[PDB]
Amino acid sequence: MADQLTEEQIAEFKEAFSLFDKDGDGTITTKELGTVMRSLGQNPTEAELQDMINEVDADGNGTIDFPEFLTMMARK
Ligand SMILES: [Ce+3]
Ligand SMILES: [Ce+3]
Numbered sequence: 178m179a180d181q182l183t184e185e186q187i188a189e190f191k192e193a194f195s196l197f198d199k200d201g202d203g204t205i206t207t208k209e210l211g212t213v214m215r216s217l218g219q220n221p222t223e224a225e226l227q228d229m230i231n232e233v234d235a236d237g238n239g240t241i242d243f244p245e246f247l248t249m250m251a252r253k
Contacts, residue, residue: 190250194243205241206230 180189197205197213207226214220221229231237233245241249 187247190247191243193250194246197241197246203243205246206239210241 180186194205195201197209199209199212200206207223207230210226210230211221211223230239230241233248234241236245
């Protein structure tokens with residue numbers, strides 16, 4: 178019906194995570210990360226990304242989730 182800050186807000190962020198998540202599986206790997214970058218005009222190696230993914234992923238699953246990525250947004 179409408180939107181709203183707080184939790185509701187996140188609902189929106191969902192889409193954000195999608196941008197990066199080109200798998201729609203619910204996770205953001207490296208490639209998927211080195212993809213959207215094309216929009217910004219970037220394209221780091223699988224090494225850098227890994228570090229970037231290991232900058233939010235405190236679980237060390239190797240990939241990035243929605244809640245693990247949400248933090249990335251909070252940053253900047
Ligand atoms: Ce994915
Ligand atoms: Ce993770």
